[PDB]
Amino acid sequence: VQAGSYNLALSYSVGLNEVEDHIKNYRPQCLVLTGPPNFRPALVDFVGTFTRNLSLMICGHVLIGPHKQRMPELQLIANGHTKWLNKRKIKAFYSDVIAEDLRRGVQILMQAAGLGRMKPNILVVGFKKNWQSAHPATVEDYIGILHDAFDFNYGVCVMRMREGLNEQATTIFQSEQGKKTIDIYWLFDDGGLTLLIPYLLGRKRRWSKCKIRVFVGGQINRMDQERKAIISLLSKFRLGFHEVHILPDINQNPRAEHTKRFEDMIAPFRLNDGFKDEATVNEMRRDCPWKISDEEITKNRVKSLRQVRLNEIVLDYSRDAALIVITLPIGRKGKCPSSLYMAWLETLSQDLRPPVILIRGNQENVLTFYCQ
Amino acid sequence: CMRTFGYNTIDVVPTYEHYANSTQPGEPRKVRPTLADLHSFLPVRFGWVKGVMIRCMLNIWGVILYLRLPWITAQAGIVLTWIIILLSVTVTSITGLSISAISTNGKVKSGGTYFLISRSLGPELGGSIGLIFAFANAVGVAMHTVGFAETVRDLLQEYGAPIVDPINDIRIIAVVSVTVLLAISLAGMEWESKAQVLFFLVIMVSFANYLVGTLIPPSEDKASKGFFSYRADIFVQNLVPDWRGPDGTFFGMFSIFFPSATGILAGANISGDLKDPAIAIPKGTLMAIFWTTISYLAISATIGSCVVRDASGVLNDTVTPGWGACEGLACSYGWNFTECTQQHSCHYGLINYYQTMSMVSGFAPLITAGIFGATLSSALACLVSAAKVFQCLCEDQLYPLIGFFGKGYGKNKEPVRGYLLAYAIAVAFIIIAELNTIAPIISNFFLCSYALINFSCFHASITNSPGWRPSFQYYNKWAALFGAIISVVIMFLLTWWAALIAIGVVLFLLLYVIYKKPEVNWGSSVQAGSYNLALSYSVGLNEVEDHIKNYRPQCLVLTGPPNFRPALVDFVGTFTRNLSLMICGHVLIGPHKQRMPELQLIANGHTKWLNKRKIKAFYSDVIAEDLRRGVQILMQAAGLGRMKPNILVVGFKKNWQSAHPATVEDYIGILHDAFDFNYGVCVMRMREGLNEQATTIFQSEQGKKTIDIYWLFDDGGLTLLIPYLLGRKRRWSKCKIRVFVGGQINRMDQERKAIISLLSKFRLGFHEVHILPDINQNPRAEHTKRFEDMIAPFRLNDGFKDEATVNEMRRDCPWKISDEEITKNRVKSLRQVRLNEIVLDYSRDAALIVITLPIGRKGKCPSSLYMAWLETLSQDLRPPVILIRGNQENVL
Numbered sequence A: 001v002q003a004g005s006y007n008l009a010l011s012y013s014v015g016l017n018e019v020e021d022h023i024k025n026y027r028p029q030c031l032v033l034t035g036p037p038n039f040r041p042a043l044v045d046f047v048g049t050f051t052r053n054l055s056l057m058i059c060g061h062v063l064i065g066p067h068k069q070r071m072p073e074l075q076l077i078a079n080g081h082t083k084w085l086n087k088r089k090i091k092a093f094y095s096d097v098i099a100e101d102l103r104r105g106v107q108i109l110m111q112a113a114g115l116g117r118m119k120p121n122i123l124v125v126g127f128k129k130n131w132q133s134a135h136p137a138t139v140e141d142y143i144g145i146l147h148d149a150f151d152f153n154y155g156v157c158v159m160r161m162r163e164g165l166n167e168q169a170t171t172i173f174q175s176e177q178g179k180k181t182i183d184i185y186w187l188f189d190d191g192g193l194t195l196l197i198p199y200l201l202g203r204k205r206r207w208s209k210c211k212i213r214v215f216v217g218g219q220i221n222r223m224d225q226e227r228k229a230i231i232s233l234l235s236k237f238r239l240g241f242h243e244v245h246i247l248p249d250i251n252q253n254p255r256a257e258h259t260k261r262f263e264d265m266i267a268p269f270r271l272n273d274g275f276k277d278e279a280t281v282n283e284m285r286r287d288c289p290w291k292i293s294d295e296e297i298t299k300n301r302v303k304s305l306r307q308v309r310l311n312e313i314v315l316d317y318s319r320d321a322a323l324i325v326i327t328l329p330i331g332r333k334g335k336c337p338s339s340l341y342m343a344w345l346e347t348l349s350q351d352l353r354p355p356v357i358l359i360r361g362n363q364e365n366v367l368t369f370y371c372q
Numbered sequence B: 001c002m003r004t005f006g007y008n009t010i011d012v013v014p015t016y017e018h019y020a021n022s023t024q025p026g027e028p029r030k031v032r033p034t035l036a037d038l039h040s041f042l043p044v045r046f047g048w049v050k051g052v053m054i055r056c057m058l059n060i061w062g063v064i065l066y067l068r069l070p071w072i073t074a075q076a077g078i079v080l081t082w083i084i085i086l087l088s089v090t091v092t093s094i095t096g097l098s099i100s101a102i103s104t105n106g107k108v109k110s111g112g113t114y115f116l117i118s119r120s121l122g123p124e125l126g127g128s129i130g131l132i133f134a135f136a137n138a139v140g141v142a143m144h145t146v147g148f149a150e151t152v153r154d155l156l157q158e159y160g161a162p163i164v165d166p167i168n169d170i171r172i173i174a175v176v177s178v179t180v181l182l183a184i185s186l187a188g189m190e191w192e193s194k195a196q197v198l199f200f201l202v203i204m205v206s207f208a209n210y211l212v213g214t215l216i217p218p219s220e221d222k223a224s225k226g227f228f229s230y231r232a233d234i235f236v237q238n239l240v241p242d243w244r245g246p247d248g249t250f251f252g253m254f255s256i257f258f259p260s261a262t263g264i265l266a267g268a269n270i271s272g273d274l275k276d277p278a279i280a281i282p283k284g285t286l287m288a289i290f291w292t293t294i295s296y297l298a299i300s301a302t303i304g305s306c307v308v309r310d311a312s313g314v315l316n317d318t319v320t321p322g323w324g325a326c327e328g329l330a331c332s333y334g335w336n337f338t339e340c341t342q343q344h345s346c347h348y349g350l351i352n353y354y355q356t357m358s359m360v361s362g363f364a365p366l367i368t369a370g371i372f373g374a375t376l377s378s379a380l381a382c383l384v385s386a387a388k389v390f391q392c393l394c395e396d397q398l399y400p401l402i403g404f405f406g407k408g409y410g411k412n413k414e415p416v417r418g419y420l421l422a423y424a425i426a427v428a429f430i431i432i433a434e435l436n437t438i439a440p441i442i443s444n445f446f447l448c449s450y451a452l453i454n455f456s457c458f459h460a461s462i463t464n465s466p467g468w469r470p471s472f473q474y475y476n477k478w479a480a481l482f483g484a485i486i487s488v489v490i491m492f493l494l495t496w497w498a499a500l501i502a503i504g505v506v507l508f509l510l511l512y513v514i515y516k517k518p519e520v521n522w523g524s525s526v527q528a529g530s531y532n533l534a535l536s537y538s539v540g541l542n543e544v545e546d547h548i549k550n551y552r553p554q555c556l557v558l559t560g561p562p563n564f565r566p567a568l569v570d571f572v573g574t575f576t577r578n579l580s581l582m583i584c585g586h587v588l589i590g591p592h593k594q595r596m597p598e599l600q601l602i603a604n605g606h607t608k609w610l611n612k613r614k615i616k617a618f619y620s621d622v623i624a625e626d627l628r629r630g631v632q633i634l635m636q637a638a639g640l641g642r643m644k645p646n647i648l649v650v651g652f653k654k655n656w657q658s659a660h661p662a663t664v665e666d667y668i669g670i671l672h673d674a675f676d677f678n679y680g681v682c683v684m685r686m687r688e689g690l691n692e693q694a695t696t697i698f699q700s701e702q703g704k705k706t707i708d709i710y711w712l713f714d715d716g717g718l719t720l721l722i723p724y725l726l727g728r729k730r731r732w733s734k735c736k737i738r739v740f741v742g743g744q745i746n747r748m749d750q751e752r753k754a755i756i757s758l759l760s761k762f763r764l765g766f767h768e769v770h771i772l773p774d775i776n777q778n779p780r781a782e783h784t785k786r787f788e789d790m791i792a793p794f795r796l797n798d799g800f801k802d803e804a805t806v807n808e809m810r811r812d813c814p815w816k817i818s819d820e821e822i823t824k825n826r827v828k829s830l831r832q833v834r835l836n837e838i839v840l841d842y843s844r845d846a847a848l849i850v851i852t853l854p855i856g857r858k859g860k861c862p863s864s865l866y867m868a869w870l871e872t873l874s875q876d877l878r879p880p881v882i883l884i885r886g887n888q889e890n891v892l
């Protein structure tokens, strides 16, 4: 029976080659970074919930060790991990690679994982809960992994949960959320990926009863008019979202107590280089690329403050939401040191009861109201 | 603050303009910054009532409602006529649900049913349905106009103006009518809408006249003609069916009624001129269906409650005591009809008078006007729908000889050419006037279109594509499938031969469109379903465990761009096609000088070239600083679950001698990594080198040339396996597999039973097994000199040095070969020189040579020397030489 199954799979994979890619037929092609899947099952579950029977879902594990010492273990443990996934009833492909560092292995996976058109277009990673107590090199590597995912047009999906990452353990996602609401903070236009992921989640039996609330930014003067132009774009997409809220007060200065929290949270990583030219900043950067010069802090005052203010708005709306979705701010390479970038991600999702997902598309349309 | 939010950041905020494609107002296009920007550094529109409801209702209503409905009710009973109407409404309403669901998805543009079907199911069936629908509507224009002409000719002969004759006179009247309709249609969409509204008002006045007349106490003549007003006895008597005549069968009534009440796509077919199709099509069509159904039910109920089935009509039939005799209770109202119901003669009543509806009404002229309005409205709607559907078809340019008619003259498209063609077809088909032999074909065509609409809905729903997000949510995939199946079955039952003809035409059109391979890509449930099948079966294959009996050769071919080394890809495809996985790898070192979209376009182009090449292979390209790193990445990650490559096919670098030695060093490193990763290596050496479709030696047949296999090492059967599957193909059938097994003459049957006769068990059937015991005998000095001279340029003369001194020297020059190694492995060196001597004499006319690949010891054997054997192992060999070394796992 294996031969016929393999032949069917190969035949259909080959036949998928002539099929062209269409916006109406786009599918989230997920490459979750779980390592050993049993260590971080929650994450897997979530992706499965919206990939089940709908799109491909690969699991990426990077090994640290010579091939010879790993080849036997590689072959005899990949099957164990696959059988664990199957026993958990997930239609995901396990794939492990060996590299000196996690970033290199993730790069090779994103570059080569996939057969033809069934290659991931999204990288689903888990939040680094200990990014402060960890060696700054690790935080720099994680941020660089995000940058690499962007370089490949991979839509990033950073998942943060209060509990953390770590019979099979039961996670919150295997239960039913019920009537709780799904808050989607579509602050910036990522091409719709921030909206498709929660739409597919609600289409599942466990999220059908969730009342999806969409939050957008507007100005206090034209709240009413802007409430309708966005309640109309959602209608054109025919996503079934219930409400549309607007927050003119996102640009107001964060509270004087919370803002200092952000500054004290980035105190250790400050390089204190706010009076020297960029050509005079690199030498004290070679060993410490994560250090944040005072110069870079000045140009990111508004942006850093806005993230703090965003966390204020979310902390007063989604206190009791089943799931929180917030667009992922995009730092610029060469101007957003890993320390500053991680602070935003930490500052964005924090202090609440987060099933928060920080999604961010590749600035390419994934939802269309315009049949060809 | 009080700023328009996204005012202090280069990132944008969601806006409709970002997703709009059409010429969105504003003379511009606010487009979100590209990921490389944030990242990196440095015409009247009608409403639903006047565009869907009115038009669909006018198309539904026809002559049958006025002329055959009272007959059907009288013949079948009120209950049975209601049941027939309910079955017809069930089919039509399920089709309407399907069409509404298909309409809601996306923004429906001009084209009508054709546009929706093509954009939902696929271009292949879309074109066929478009052509069928266009022709059917064109012919229906003629049929409706002929019916109207027949009614007018009847009313004329009622007044004594035969002109020519009952026949070939309706020709003239209906041609005049069709010219009138064509002129009005060409006038303008507003004029057509006004004409439809006028016909609607006329039909409404006719209905009101009928209903008022039925409530007037009967007159003398009307009473004689069987009209008796509302009576409980008459209503109860007509409940049961009184079948009579050759059409007295229930299925006959059902077949007569069904075509009349199916014109439910009149509104959708002009969706181009709809203010908002997504909300006007569903509700309008459902309301039209409901109102027509209620009208039919009410007409049946009332007419069955006023007119008796049989009546004489002669005034002398008054009832006087003694005279005559009664059966039933009609005489209770002072009328005797026995003189007929015994003889079955007179012509009046609900079962023998088709014009009973006109007589029961308050004024016959109003009924005639209603008939005229119904026929004309149906004809005009058919003409408009056919013209617009054909215009969309031609705009879609699927078919070769319809492009001309697509272009639209004037403003607001206005498809004048299509209108003229439809009018010409209608007049040519009406000149015949012989439509009864052609009507069932058109009815079956429309049934085919209904089946395809319902199946498009069901297929889209079952596929469950992310793009399938339809606003209408009162449908059912199972209901749509039931409607489609019922459409096909009804089409077959009404007339099996006509159904066969329609299915044959549709199949011809579908096969023609699929043959013509229309390049247009609209997105469809077909493509999404193909992806779903691929994913489902790939995951299924993944869930299966691993063992030996399922082993397949899964080749990763280092061919860079496939169009630069066609011979390698052709070779791999020959023995991998339809058997296992084949992946064409490609490593770009470069700076890559491009955003990812450019690389994606190049990859799509290369995949298209592969597909045109007729090769089932996946083109995977990566980026890395050097070729070694790209190969390592591809070996490490390329694949999907179980269906990963386990064999590395790579070409031969013929110009290693004159190139920088680091190139040969990294080549040998690639081979060593492949061996380390448990990859069976396969070196494809061609005498001319590896570097619209380029011809290759592996394409042409080769007849009966000898396939020589020079086995000299038990690698697990990989060496024999490839030629095995390589000869089971058509192009390698007549060739003889002369495997020169490395062994001894005494062993001709041992490795025979070991492989050759075990390959009688392995079903290889190798004819000859010629032993070569002279491999170890000393080679010729000249050939030996050729080998030493080849290794001379890389000579390092490290032998006159200490072991540690040996190690230090190569901390920067590991390509160079020391003399100490030469003495260390002299026996192997001369072994390969002689082995090439054995092959050149023995295998000179062979079609393909397979030789076990020599394997040096990394570190213990230098890279340059190892490559030197490979060059010397297969030098000057005429046919394409293949070097193989298996995983060390028994393949068979």
Ligand SMILES: NS(=O)(=O)c1cc([C@]2(O)NC(=O)c3ccccc32)ccc1Cl
Pocket (backbone or CB within 6 Å): B059, B136, B137, B139, B140, B141, B143, B259, B260, B261, B262, B263, B264, B265, B266, B269, B378, B381, B382, B385, B442, B443, B446
């Ligand atoms: N205009 S239409 O395509 O929606 C349509 C028209 C009819 C039609 O007007 N109704 C008919 O009885 C008929 C006969 C011949 C041609 C056309 C017709 C029947 C079904 C449909 Cl789906």
